[PDB]
Design a protein around this motif. Structure first.
Motif, PDB file in Angstrom:
ATOM      1  N   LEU A 183      -2.039  -5.679  30.281  1.00 18.92           N
ATOM      2  CA  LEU A 183      -1.766  -5.156  31.487  1.00 18.92           C
ATOM      3  C   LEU A 183      -0.729  -4.104  30.965  1.00 18.92           C
ATOM      4  CD1 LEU A 183      -1.606  -8.185  34.062  1.00 18.92           C
ATOM      5  CD2 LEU A 183      -3.300  -6.440  33.584  1.00 18.92           C
ATOM      6  N   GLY A 184       0.493  -4.525  31.474  1.00 18.91           N
ATOM      7  CA  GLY A 184       1.431  -3.554  31.003  1.00 18.91           C
ATOM      8  C   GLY A 184       1.341  -2.401  31.745  1.00 18.91           C
ATOM      9  N   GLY A 185       1.585  -1.048  31.267  1.00 12.98           N
ATOM     10  CA  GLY A 185       1.664   0.335  31.840  1.00 12.98           C
ATOM     11  C   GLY A 185       2.291   0.187  33.201  1.00 12.98           C
ATOM     12  N   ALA A 186       1.815   0.685  34.285  1.00 15.47           N
ATOM     13  CA  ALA A 186       2.621   0.814  35.608  1.00 15.47           C
ATOM     14  C   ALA A 186       2.873  -0.542  36.223  1.00 15.47           C
ATOM     15  CB  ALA A 186       1.796   1.461  36.710  1.00 15.47           C
ATOM     16  N   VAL A 187       2.090  -1.898  35.440  1.00 15.65           N
ATOM     17  CA  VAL A 187       2.580  -3.102  36.154  1.00 15.65           C
ATOM     18  C   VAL A 187       4.005  -3.431  35.532  1.00 15.65           C
ATOM     19  CG1 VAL A 187       1.975  -5.431  36.038  1.00 15.65           C
ATOM     20  CG2 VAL A 187       0.209  -3.884  36.366  1.00 15.65           C
ATOM     21  N   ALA A 188       4.247  -3.058  34.514  1.00 18.60           N
ATOM     22  CA  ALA A 188       5.427  -3.401  33.926  1.00 18.60           C
ATOM     23  C   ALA A 188       6.738  -2.533  34.150  1.00 18.60           C
ATOM     24  CB  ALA A 188       5.405  -3.393  32.263  1.00 18.60           C
ATOM     25  N   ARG A 189       6.257  -1.616  34.665  1.00 21.02           N
ATOM     26  CA  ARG A 189       7.487  -0.508  35.156  1.00 21.02           C
ATOM     27  C   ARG A 189       8.081  -0.999  36.531  1.00 21.02           C
ATOM     28  NH1 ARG A 189       4.017   3.474  32.667  1.00 21.02           N
ATOM     29  NH2 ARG A 189       3.527   3.911  35.131  1.00 21.02           N
TER      30      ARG A 189
END
Ligand SMILES: Cc1cc2nc3c(=O)[nH]c(=O)nc-3n(C[C@H](O)[C@H](O)[C@H](O)COP(=O)(O)OP(=O)(O)OC[C@H]3O[C@@H](n4cnc5c(N)ncnc54)[C@H](O)[C@@H]3O)c2cc1C
Ligand SMILES: Cc1cc2nc3c(=O)[nH]c(=O)nc-3n(C[C@H](O)[C@H](O)[C@H](O)COP(=O)(O)OP(=O)(O)OC[C@H]3O[C@@H](n4cnc5c(N)ncnc54)[C@H](O)[C@@H]3O)c2cc1C
Lengths: 458, 458
Positions: free
Chosen positions: B355-361
């Motif tokens: 996931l990461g990307g915009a989810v983590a922001r």
């Protein structure tokens, strides 16, 4: 301007939403897929249930308001919006009940094809319908409905087992092969002429993964490809479906950049059946010319349905000329290629479809759909963006149609354009038209439902 | 056994469809996607409007009936059906209203994801959601919602702007950033704990064709493949999504016969952006091992959504064990590969997602969704047909989880199985659990809504 007490009764019976010319969302709500149709209804009635539709039908009849009915809004003639009348808009009525055991789907009249296919494909089931997911089930089915499953399983109407319909007098009826069968015959091909269908029931088929191919041939090899196609399809098994879409090549990376924007034959094909046999079958039809930008995949049927058309662009303005063929001669093929070479918009297609198969095995008078026995469909589907360009794209379609007039007969009511109101008798033929007028006289004698390929009563 | 006047009061207000145990369609209506859950409600209330849900909630409260709420029926814990209670069944509330201009979708709480994507894609628009079209929008969004568009555009909840929600006392609320924000925080990741969501509003994004690939690698090359994946995704741009699905190789014509039914890695990837850049991006990650059965396509987003999963087969019975990881060590990788080699069913997958990307922001406290900062998700997703084989497939997911569990943290509430009611505190963490408990005390003090990953009040 409406009678206040009648409007009051209507609003009281109506649980859906009413959109008036002064509401902020009126302009968006009155737009339909054919952007060349700009019309301003007196009232938009967003129905949420069969009694909603009853209330709306009754109110329009008492008020003398011109009735437009809207499913998915895809009418190529612009029938789903009116100037000054009422839009009975069904788009909120989108539910599908699927029985896996009984292989049945019951779908409301406002469903979009992609909602239907998702619901049936939850159980690996399907029934034939059109190739673009956001088409409405409603208008499509009522005019016949064909696509990737039709050579195997027939038109959508060949899988319809009953409807619930609201007639012009406000009544609700069920029509089936055993109950109001004259009305059932008529709704299977007769359009919205006999009432508002609020639920369709279809038999379903198990449809697992389908081997699919899409590829592009240079017009330099156009003659050999199109001849190969028409020769092959005359004896092909029902399981093979193979369609040709002449168009400018989309600027996609599977295609060499020097072909982008140039006229080509986009060939799409699939096999309804075992994917290993399908692979063998598709390779057997992929090489009549050099296939450029070839995509082959083994797809869930829901993804095949969602795939059309390469480029994924929704055009704003459209104009279509269409007809059937009984044969596709070499000279007709050169005419097709000559006009394909003059396509201007990247959203225009000159479509050559081959039906036949299961569609042609249904006896002709079993439904109101005409020309089961003509296996070819040509659709000059002009589509573009710029409103100052309408005349050039309309001209391409009109001239191409005229040039092929010696080969063309009949016409699919669902591909008819706004200026084609008088092609109805020719499309249906005299025998079907006469029987349809008789059902019209029984069920809609005042022609309350006349925004359709219209069948006047008597 | 029900109080007549209470039942009559329900029927006076309710305009939907009731399904009683003696009714023909009872047995199919009570079946949910997790076929191991065989329960028999006293009543299925198929609601068709927000007032139907109000009547059903108040009827259940007054009657003492245990409340199940059903959207698409995909609960991995079996929460959408109850023994002896009422199912508040939203599956007929499937309407989506899209504004092209405003880039807004208002979707009812019963929609299937494929209905939603069909409606938004009619306007070349989309918003992130899960990867299987027949999943329900309701339970998915309420637990957060991730899929192909998440790295670029966030979870479903990161595009959610308001809900209409029926609370346990029968009142209808709007929750948004401006209205009942406490509730708004909670419904974005806190499940159906706080009431029945009858409408969701989403911001949408313009999403044209996406370059996509799927291929299969031999487990021989598992180590370099998974190591190449975890290393690449650590610095990958948001536009690339790349997922690994360890499974038996489906018997499809694109794969060599000698791999059919053997454990492999099915890698699927896509680029959300320009398809020519996408082609460059995917070609660069396709060759970390030898790509067998390679499919590359330039797809409409609706067709990417309909694509998962290769083989297009629906299992009867499932059992899931899942968690997040902060890093995927060499030791974790070896364990993954060791248990994937033991996969018995052709429907089971061991999923490795990044996931990461915009989810983590999104800041961790901004929603009820936990573990934004862990980019890895592993899902041991056992699935099969024969009830006599439950123990063998359940054992596979249990033992793979146990061998990995020291590397795992948290857990997605939407991947919890029927025996994991005790993982709730840990899944959410102490802070979120405590804030959710206070919203529970305010909005559902009597825990009427307890068939979910439950947060008891106070
Ligand atoms: C992009 C595109 C792709 C297409 N692809 C195919 C294809 O593959 N195969 C195919 O066969 N056709 C196809 N069509 C044509 C389609 O069948 C017709 O446009 C059809 O009328 C669409 O129905 P609709 O409900 O979306 O349209 P609308 O504009 O809503 O309605 C069309 C007509 O049906 C009436 N109507 C609609 N719903 C109801 C209802 N529930 N009860 C009563 N009357 C109703 C309307 O009054 C009107 O006369 C396509 C059209 C488009 C624009
Ligand atoms: C094959 C499959 C693929 C999946 N893929 C993904 C994926 O890619 N990404 C992802 O994030 N998740 C995924 N999921 C998980 C999915 O998010 C959860 O299973 C979710 O709970 C499904 O929602 P549902 O409405 O279908 O389920 P249901 O069984 O109907 O409901 C699940 C829970 O939500 C409640 N509920 C449902 N609708 C409402 C509503 N409107 N208001 C209040 N409560 C409601 C129910 O009471 C229950 O507690 C997948 C699940 C399956 C089975």
């Amino acid at each position: 301007q409406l009678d206040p007490a009648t409007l009051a009764a209507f609003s009281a019976a109506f649980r859906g939403e009413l959109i008036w010319p002064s509401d902020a969302d009126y302009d968006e709500a009155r737009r339909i897929w054919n952007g060349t149709i700009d019309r301003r209804p007196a009232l938009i009635a967003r129905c949420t249930s069969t009694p909603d539709v009853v209330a709306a039908v009754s109110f329009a009849r008492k008020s003398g308001l011109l009735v437009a009915v809207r499913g998915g809004g895809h009418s190529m003639a612009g029938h789903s919006v009116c100037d000054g009348g009422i839009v009975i808009d069904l788009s909120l009525m989108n539910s599908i009940k699927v029985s896996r055991r009984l292989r049945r789907a019951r779908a409301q009249g406002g469903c979009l094809l992609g909602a239907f296919d998702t619901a049936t494909q939850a159980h690996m089931l399907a029934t034939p319908a059109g190739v673009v997911s956001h088409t409405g089930l409603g208008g499509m089915v009522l005019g016949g409905g064909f696509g990737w499953l039709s050579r195997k399983y027939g038109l959508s109407i060949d899988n319809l087992t009953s409807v619930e319909i609201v007639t012009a007098d406000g009544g609700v009826l069920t029509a089936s092969d055993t109950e109001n069968p004259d009305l059932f015959w008529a709704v299977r091909g007769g359009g919205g002429n006999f009432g508002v269908v609020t639920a369709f029931e279809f038999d379903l088929h198990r449809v697992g993964p389908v081997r699919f191919a899409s590829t592009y041939y240079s017009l330099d090899e156009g003659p050999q490809v199109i001849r190969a196609w028409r020769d092959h399809m005359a004896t092909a098994p029902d399981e093979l479906t193979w369609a040709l879409y002449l168009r400018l090549a989309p600027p996609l990376p599977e295609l060499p950049a020097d072909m982008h924007g140039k006229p080509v034959i986009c060939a799409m094909s699939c096999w309804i059946g075992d994917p290993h046999e399908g692979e063998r079958q598709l390779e057997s039809i992929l090489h009549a010319g050099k296939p450029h930008g070839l995509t082959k995949a083994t797809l869930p049927y829901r993804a095949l349905q969602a795939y059309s058309f390469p480029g994924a662009v929704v055009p704003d303005r459209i104009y279509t000329k269409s007809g059937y063929l009984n044969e596709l001669s070499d000279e007709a093929t050169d005419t097709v290629l000559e006009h394909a070479a003059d396509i201007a918009s990247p959203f225009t297609q000159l479509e050559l479809l081959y039906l036949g198969g299961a569609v042609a095995r249904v006896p002709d008078d079993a439904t109101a759909y005409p020309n089961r026995q003509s296996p070819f469909v040509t659709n000059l589907a002009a589509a573009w963006m710029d409103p100052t360009e309408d005349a050039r794209h309309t001209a391409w379609a009109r001239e191409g149609y005229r040039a092929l007039a010696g080969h063309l007969s009949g016409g699919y009511v669902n591909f008819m354009n706004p200026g084609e109101a008088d092609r109805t008798r020719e499309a249906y033929g005299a025998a079907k038209f006469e029987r349809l007028q008789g059902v019209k006289a029984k069920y809609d004698p005042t022609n309350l439902f006349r925004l359709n390929q219209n069948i006047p009563p008597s």
